């Protein structure tokens, strides 16, 4: 039935979308930490190697 299918599909849609948002936020955090680590590695190369 379309009336009940819309509600079910809507709740699935909202759930998947919010997990996807969480994934994006986590990726941004990890990316910034990795950029800082890259700066540190650049320093280590320049004055240890």
């Amino acid at each position: 039935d379309v009336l009940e299918q819309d509600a079910q599909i809507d709740r699935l849609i909202n759930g998947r979308l919010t997990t996807l948002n969480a994934f994006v936020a986590q990726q941004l955090v990890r990316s910034e930490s990795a950029a800082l680590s890259a700066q540190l590695a650049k320093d280590k190369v320049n004055e240890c190697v």
Binding site: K42, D43, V45, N46, E47
Partner: protein, 99 residues
Amino acid sequence: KAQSKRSGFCGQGTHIVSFVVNAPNGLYFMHVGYYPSNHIEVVSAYGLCDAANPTNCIAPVNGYFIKTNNTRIVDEWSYTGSSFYAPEPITSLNTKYVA
């Protein structure tokens, strides 16, 4: 506040001087560096051994290009040197050189 001899700090070439101005939400830096831009390969040697207590260090920079034991700085071909570069170490291998 100083040039110094760093590595990964003031980037892009041998740091000479640096300036700062204000910019939206932070500071804008302008580092001035030194760049070689033409490189020629010259044979050089380590030190000299004349007779007694005569060992000579290469200089603050290696220099010691071939011709007249003449020592050289980082830029250009060798120029006449008068102890203004070479102090006096102990000997090393390949005598008549500190090689």
